[PDB]
Amino acid sequence: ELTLRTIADEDDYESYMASAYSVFLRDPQKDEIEVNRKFTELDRMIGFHDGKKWVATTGAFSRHVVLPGGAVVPVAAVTAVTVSPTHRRRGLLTTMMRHQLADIRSRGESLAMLFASEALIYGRFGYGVATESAELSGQVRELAFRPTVDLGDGTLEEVSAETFLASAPAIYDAVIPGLPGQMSRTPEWWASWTLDSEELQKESGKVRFVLHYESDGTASGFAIYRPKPGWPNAELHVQEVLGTNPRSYARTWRYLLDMDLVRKIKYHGASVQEELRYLVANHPSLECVVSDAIQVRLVDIPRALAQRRYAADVDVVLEVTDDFLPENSGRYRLRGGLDHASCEITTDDADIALTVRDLGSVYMGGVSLQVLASAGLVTELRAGAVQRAATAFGWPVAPSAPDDF
Amino acid sequence: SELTLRTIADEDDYESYMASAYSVFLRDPQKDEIEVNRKFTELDRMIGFHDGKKWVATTGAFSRHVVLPGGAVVPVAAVTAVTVSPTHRRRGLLTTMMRHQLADIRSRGESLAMLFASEALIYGRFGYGVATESAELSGQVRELAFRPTVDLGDGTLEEVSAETFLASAPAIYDAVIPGLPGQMSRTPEWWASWTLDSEELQKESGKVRFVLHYESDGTASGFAIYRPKPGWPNAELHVQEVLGTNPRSYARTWRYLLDMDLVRKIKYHGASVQEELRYLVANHPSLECVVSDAIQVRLVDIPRALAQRRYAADVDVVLEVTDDFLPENSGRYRLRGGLDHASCEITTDDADIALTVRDLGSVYMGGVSLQVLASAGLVTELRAGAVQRAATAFGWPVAPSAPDDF
Amino acid sequence: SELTLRTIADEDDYESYMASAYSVFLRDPQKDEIEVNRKFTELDRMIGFHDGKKWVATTGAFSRHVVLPGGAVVPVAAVTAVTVSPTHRRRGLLTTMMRHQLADIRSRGESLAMLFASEALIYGRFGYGVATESAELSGQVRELAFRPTVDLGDGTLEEVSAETFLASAPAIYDAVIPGLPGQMSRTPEWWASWTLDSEELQKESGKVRFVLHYESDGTASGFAIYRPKPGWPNAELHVQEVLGTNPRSYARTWRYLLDMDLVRKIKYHGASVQEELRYLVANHPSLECVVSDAIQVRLVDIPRALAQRRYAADVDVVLEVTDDFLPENSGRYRLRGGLDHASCEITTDDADIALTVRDLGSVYMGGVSLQVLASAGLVTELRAGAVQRAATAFGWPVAPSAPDDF
Amino acid sequence: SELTLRTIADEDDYESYMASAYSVFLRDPQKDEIEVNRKFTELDRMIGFHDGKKWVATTGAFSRHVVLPGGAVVPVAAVTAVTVSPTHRRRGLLTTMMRHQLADIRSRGESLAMLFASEALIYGRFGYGVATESAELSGQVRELAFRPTVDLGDGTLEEVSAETFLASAPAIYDAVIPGLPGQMSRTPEWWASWTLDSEELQKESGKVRFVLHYESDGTASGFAIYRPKPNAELHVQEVLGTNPRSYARTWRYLLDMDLVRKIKYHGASVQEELRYLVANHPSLECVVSDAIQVRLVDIPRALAQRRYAADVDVVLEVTDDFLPENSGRYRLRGGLDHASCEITTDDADIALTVRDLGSVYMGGVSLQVLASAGLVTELRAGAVQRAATAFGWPVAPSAPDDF
Numbered sequence A: 001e002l003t004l005r006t007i008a009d010e011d012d013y014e015s016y017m018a019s020a021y022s023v024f025l026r027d028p029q030k031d032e033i034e035v036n037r038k039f040t041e042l043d044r045m046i047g048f049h050d051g052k053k054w055v056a057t058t059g060a061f062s063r064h065v066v067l068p069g070g071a072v073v074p075v076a077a078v079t080a081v082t083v084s085p086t087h088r089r090r091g092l093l094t095t096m097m098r099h100q101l102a103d104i105r106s107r108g109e110s111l112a113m114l115f116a117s118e119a120l121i122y123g124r125f126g127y128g129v130a131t132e133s134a135e136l137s138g139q140v141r142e143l144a145f146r147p148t149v150d151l152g153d154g155t156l157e158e159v160s161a162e163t164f165l166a167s168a169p170a171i172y173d174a175v176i177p178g179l180p181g182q183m184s185r186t187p188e189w190w191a192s193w194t195l196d197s198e199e200l201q202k203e204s205g206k207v208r209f210v211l212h213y214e215s216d217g218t219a220s221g222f223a224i225y226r227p228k229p230g231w232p233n234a235e236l237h238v239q240e241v242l243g244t245n246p247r248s249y250a251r252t253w254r255y256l257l258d259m260d261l262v263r264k265i266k267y268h269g270a271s272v273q274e275e276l277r278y279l280v281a282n283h284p285s286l287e288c289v290v291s292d293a294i295q296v297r298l299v300d301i302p303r304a305l306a307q308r309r310y311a312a313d314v315d316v317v318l319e320v321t322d323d324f325l326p327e328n329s330g331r332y333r334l335r336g337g338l339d340h341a342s343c344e345i346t347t348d349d350a351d352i353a354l355t356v357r358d359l360g361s362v363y364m365g366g367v368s369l370q371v372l373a374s375a376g377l378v379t380e381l382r383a384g385a386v387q388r389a390a391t392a393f394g395w396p397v398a399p400s401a402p403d404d405f
Numbered sequence B, C: 001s002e003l004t005l006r007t008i009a010d011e012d013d014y015e016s017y018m019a020s021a022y023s024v025f026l027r028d029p030q031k032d033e034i035e036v037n038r039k040f041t042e043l044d045r046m047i048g049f050h051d052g053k054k055w056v057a058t059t060g061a062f063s064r065h066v067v068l069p070g071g072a073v074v075p076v077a078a079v080t081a082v083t084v085s086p087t088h089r090r091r092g093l094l095t096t097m098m099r100h101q102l103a104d105i106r107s108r109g110e111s112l113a114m115l116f117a118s119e120a121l122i123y124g125r126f127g128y129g130v131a132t133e134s135a136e137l138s139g140q141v142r143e144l145a146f147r148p149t150v151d152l153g154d155g156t157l158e159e160v161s162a163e164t165f166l167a168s169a170p171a172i173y174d175a176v177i178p179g180l181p182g183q184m185s186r187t188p189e190w191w192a193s194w195t196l197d198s199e200e201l202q203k204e205s206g207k208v209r210f211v212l213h214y215e216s217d218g219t220a221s222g223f224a225i226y227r228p229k230p231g232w233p234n235a236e237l238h239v240q241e242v243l244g245t246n247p248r249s250y251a252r253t254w255r256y257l258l259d260m261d262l263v264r265k266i267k268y269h270g271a272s273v274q275e276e277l278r279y280l281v282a283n284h285p286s287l288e289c290v291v292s293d294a295i296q297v298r299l300v301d302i303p304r305a306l307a308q309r310r311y312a313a314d315v316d317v318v319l320e321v322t323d324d325f326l327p328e329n330s331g332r333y334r335l336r337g338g339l340d341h342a343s344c345e346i347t348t349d350d351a352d353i354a355l356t357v358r359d360l361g362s363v364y365m366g367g368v369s370l371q372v373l374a375s376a377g378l379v380t381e382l383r384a385g386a387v388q389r390a391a392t393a394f395g396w397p398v399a400p401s402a403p404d405d406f
Numbered sequence D: 001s002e003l004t005l006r007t008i009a010d011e012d013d014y015e016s017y018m019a020s021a022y023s024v025f026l027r028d029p030q031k032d033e034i035e036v037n038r039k040f041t042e043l044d045r046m047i048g049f050h051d052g053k054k055w056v057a058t059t060g061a062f063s064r065h066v067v068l069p070g071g072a073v074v075p076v077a078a079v080t081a082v083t084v085s086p087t088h089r090r091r092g093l094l095t096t097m098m099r100h101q102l103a104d105i106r107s108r109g110e111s112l113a114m115l116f117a118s119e120a121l122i123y124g125r126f127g128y129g130v131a132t133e134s135a136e137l138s139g140q141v142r143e144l145a146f147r148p149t150v151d152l153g154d155g156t157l158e159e160v161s162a163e164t165f166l167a168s169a170p171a172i173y174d175a176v177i178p179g180l181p182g183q184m185s186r187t188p189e190w191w192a193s194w195t196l197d198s199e200e201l202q203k204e205s206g207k208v209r210f211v212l213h214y215e216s217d218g219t220a221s222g223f224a225i226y227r228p229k230p231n232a233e234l235h236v237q238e239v240l241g242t243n244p245r246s247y248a249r250t251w252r253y254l255l256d257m258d259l260v261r262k263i264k265y266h267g268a269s270v271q272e273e274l275r276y277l278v279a280n281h282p283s284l285e286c287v288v289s290d291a292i293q294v295r296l297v298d299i300p301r302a303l304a305q306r307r308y309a310a311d312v313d314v315v316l317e318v319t320d321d322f323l324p325e326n327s328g329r330y331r332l333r334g335g336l337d338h339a340s341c342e343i344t345t346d347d348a349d350i351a352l353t354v355r356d357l358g359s360v361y362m363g364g365v366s367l368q369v370l371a372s373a374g375l376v377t378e379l380r381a382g383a384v385q386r387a388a389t390a391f392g393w394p395v396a397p398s399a400p401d402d403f
């Protein structure tokens, strides 16, 4: 006998998290679970319980994500989606998805996002891969910059997490409106993102924080990294580098690249068009491995298309097919540009037909709509409409992965 | 040691010319490659330095034609065989050969020069910029199932000899490449080199095989070039090229390569960063994607080159271009372009964007975002909102792809 | 930003000092190592830069004593804990600390300084020269049989506790080191650090073990320090040190480690390049030998340092010494040395050899040939026959060995 | 199964002789190597056992000349092609061939024999001792910058054909080897084998290349032999120069060559000058192993032909187990400009075997270390110390070309 319910208490939450970690073949990291509890809404963490333990889980964090154009809209941060192997292939995931996607529409969140882990799972529920990330690595001795890179007058300082947290949120909130895909970070989220977890210490070492100051003393850049000593070939596992100006960005990177005793650097979760890739004088010296990052499930399709902005003017009619939620299917007229966006049901002839997962794949501008059509996954009903739609759905800045959840 | 800059005089000089190039690349001269590539080599375009006994520096270019964003096929100098012997390095020989070649490219009416960079950092100083990237796709074939909505069609496939392949694939190639910017036209001589069963590639894997995809009526609509590498069942497939005239033939041919019974891993080097195969696969992470440099672009005639291509969106921008190596190109260009029009003029109006010719070449094929180059500090915005609109126009819904090797 | 150069003020300042040093080395502060090394740390010899809140640069030296060729034990500055925080690097902080330290070393009557470089190329500019090498010996224990004429004696071996080891090994150590130039005297505090069962070394292998070799009459004549690394039977023995007062105890102790069941590979880092074990083995290639830097020498008082050691053969040579970092030491010195006498004085006679102070330090311990340095172009011979005779005199029949780590 | 000890009879016998040697080494006969090495092969010096159908054991020696400490070039038996077929091993065939060869070496007036040990423990019983070591130098070329005071000179380098290389390198080689003990004289026939573009080495790397360094006046002053392996590797065979500037310039040429990431130099000296030119000493990995074993056949002559780094007057009690006729007491009087060794009746200062005496003969092994190890016995205090210094040399011995 299985029961769908929410978390009743933190004792039930610690058992809720223990079962989820158990599905991932991991001992529950008590430090990570404790810090993430500070922003865990127990009414949003659902799952199945057989009266003796949890056998399935599915959660969602109330977060806010930057869209193309600078809008910060509410988004469901889907997390902790597990089914115990003794109850798999029985429909438990299908039920939780239907309950969560209805709950997401309740709270006004126009879409949902989550990290794929295995991408082929959520495509049936309407999720589409919309963001890719690149793992950048290589020898720091080969990563000299182009001779025209301006490092500026800035200064850098190894500092504690709190002086970091006293300036980094100001630096973060200033640059993310221009970085679609990034999510806002409350004080409770910065605590988890800067957490010195024991598990990451096993892989490299304790966390360290750098701040970049301009000549007048203003903080303008930060860095999160972990050193892995080795023999001399130590490794720098970079977690995040950001700057309010190109000089603070290049100065912070050149600081990490010039660190004595270091030979190899690693930056996982970076953008596929990270500024560092184009600063290096020799591109092949910085290996770039691209993979999935964020999947998108449009819950309010007309509001989602009207919440973002488009790189160029577009007037296209889309015949959307939501196989998972047939009430969302329809035919909308999208009238969008750099400064306007409207999406309403229309009875006019359709220009393009595609599923809701394909509409979500191209939503953040990370996947080309034209490529999906030439591949046979999207159908052009009127000539020329796909090419102009693929350009408008694009964006000069590629989407990037937010902090982990 | 008196050096003379000159072109190839005859085939005996041509073979010695190639011998030094292979020697600088630390390779024995491949006689099969050198002999078949001669058929399209213009001796007067192969320059270099000769000390009276042997070639000590080389630099050449093939007269080819590349597809631009918009479908235009324009002449391009396919730069190749750029070497300086290590005994004569750091003496200015490359800088001289670059000056003579780039001037010669302009004299022949070629608006641009393209190049496969072995070492990317070499040519940035000469005005070259990385404009196209390529991805090495690989993974376990048993994890590369397609999405359930992928239509494979009713076509049939035959593995056939190179000659029958060459009697049908060139027609297929010419039909699809107008929509694939970066691809180059392939004459019979270039098809002969591209399909050459070279011994060096046989060493890494095996003899070349050729596949043709036929529609239900017998019309050839797709092809594939690959080499097997047996191992123990632990065999690999090194895919050289896959193309089709419709989505069904493309997917059907890939499914053919993936369902080979003794194969476990497959590899496709030189694929597009937006190769359709990546989106056909049901589990994206099962197809590893490593991205690296492909083609560097050197704009030789900026006004003509910018007017020959089409732009994804309307743009009216003034570009302050600085060309340090070729200062005759430094100046301000007004670009007014769209999906069906393009015009470029040297102007004195106020500039909207400041950038070097190498960065302008980087964004020319729509493979590098002009906005990212500006956010990185390499490009300077002079008037608000200009870079955003220019970046979108310089883009293209189809990413540029790498042509056949040269 | 304001920096202040000062020494450690108290014990709480000592912890912060060592914490910054470990941080620059990208390591967590090892409290077991920091606690045991404090016992011989002189706070007035530990300098560094402080920005008012934390140490941003460190540089220290232990007052130690080193054996010279001939058996003389002279004071030496054991340089240690040289760090500059990455936020303050390449700004001259080390250069200043070097000037302060080298001047401070001279005041203490120390004629020379010694050093293990993390990166050797650092200290050449300050007058340091590589003078001693060490060899990492390793191989399969079942291939390391000894020559048939090697006498193992009638001794007995016992595995003992650290307390029993420290009550008998120092007497054995003190007896052998007069004939091993480069080895340093070990106080009880240094034995405590040298035998520390540090947690970091337990991770790489296992807990430290101690072995004592007893003669037939019960006299302890040899010892061994090693750590096991279990693995499957394919375990490793990581030998830290083996010593004996006679060839039988030396060979018997090694034979004990080599005959240990369940062991397959053995490793001995920091051995001498002329370690006796290398010549005991019947099949020399079975004992792999990798040679690398050990100790760098910085001569602070040239006349005294050259007069404190003995020379393998008679020499009467005039040396034109150039000291770029400390130009006050530059000058011309006449060296008169032999097996039982040594003198060095400023002279005005014609010079026989021209060399820098770093190269003079390189040959000072008899580990680097002055003839090779001259044939290499680093040292200039002014009068024929001088370098050959001087090179032999600066040598020694026993190669210098690396002391315990600092 | 009747075995006959005999020498090579003709050229057809030479092919079968060499083929059996390669077979024991589990290798197909390399015809390019066999053909070029015939030009300096003396058939009467190639002995072995033949069972009436095939060679079942081999042992040979090349008549060469080796540089000793002090610059003297003396004749030496370069022992080679020592094999015993696995169907006839452990029956004394090698021991018999050793007695015949060493007796033949004594009859030819050669005071010593030298040999490259495949397995070192084999020949110690016959009086051979490891006397010279070689170092394999390797590392990343981008980490091998030189010290700032290294003068590269104004010379120029050219890649040349084997023929052009062979018209200038031998003169450079002959000029420098008097100061490099262990190096052997190279006739044109030996240069042909040393520079042979053998097929076996082409598979491991590539075709052989040759470099010449010319002074400002056009005088060739250095050379280099290397093979490329396309993160490409350079396998350096030999680099030499007549002055420090040409030596460093040639190495700088190999280290700055484009597309190269790692370089390897097998058979280098343990005190190779390159090791001290590098600004970052640890960047040049150094692995040391056995090179040449020495078998002293005429102790008084061999010890008197070399020079000693310092004056010495020592009496050595030498034990020669395999050849007991050489056992006896020798007084050595040597220095930088004199050397004599004679049977004496004075009290002995040091006791050692002939194999250990051969080990220290080239100055590559310390007599003090052998004594401290228990292999050599000191009879009078202070004798080993002075003898060890004299038996040393300011230039470490180096390995000659392969044989």
Ligand SMILES: CC(=O)SCCNC(=O)CCNC(=O)[C@H](O)C(C)(C)COP(=O)(O)OP(=O)(O)OC[C@H]1O[C@@H](n2cnc3c(N)ncnc32)[C@H](O)[C@@H]1OP(=O)(O)O
Binding pocket: A260, A261, C024, C025, C079, C080, C081, C082, C083, C084, C085, C088, C089, C090, C091, C092, C093, C094, C095, C096, C115, C116, C117, C118, C119, C121, C122, C125, C406
């Ligand atoms: C204690 C021991 O046993 S050795 C421990 C020291 N080794 C370490 O790696 C400790 C970590 N500390 C560092 O790396 C420091 O940054 C150090 C050692 C490089 C010195 O700090 P700095 O303040 O930057 O040195 P300073 O500026 O005073 O002068 C250094 C000079 O030598 C050069 N140099 C110093 N260390 C190095 C090095 N590791 N690699 C290359 N060049 C170096 C500098 O470039 C400069 O020479 P220049 O005039 O040509 O530029």
Ligand SMILES: CC(=O)SCCNC(=O)CCNC(=O)[C@H](O)C(C)(C)COP(=O)(O)OP(=O)(O)OC[C@H]1O[C@@H](n2cnc3c(N)ncnc32)[C@H](O)[C@@H]1OP(=O)(O)O
Binding pocket: D024, D025, D079, D080, D081, D082, D083, D084, D085, D088, D089, D090, D091, D092, D093, D094, D095, D096, D116, D117, D118, D119, D121, D122, D125, D403
């Ligand atoms: C470049 C050169 O010329 S060196 C190349 C020679 N090395 C080779 O491995 C070549 C291939 N040939 C062989 O291996 C032969 O079998 C050899 C070298 C072992 C000698 O052949 P054999 O006829 O068996 O030699 P022989 O019978 O005279 O043995 C004499 C002693 O040496 C010992 N011995 C010789 N070689 C070895 C060895 N590789 N391992 C162990 N013991 C050995 C024998 O056990 C025997 O010991 P003993 O006196 O206590 O009985």
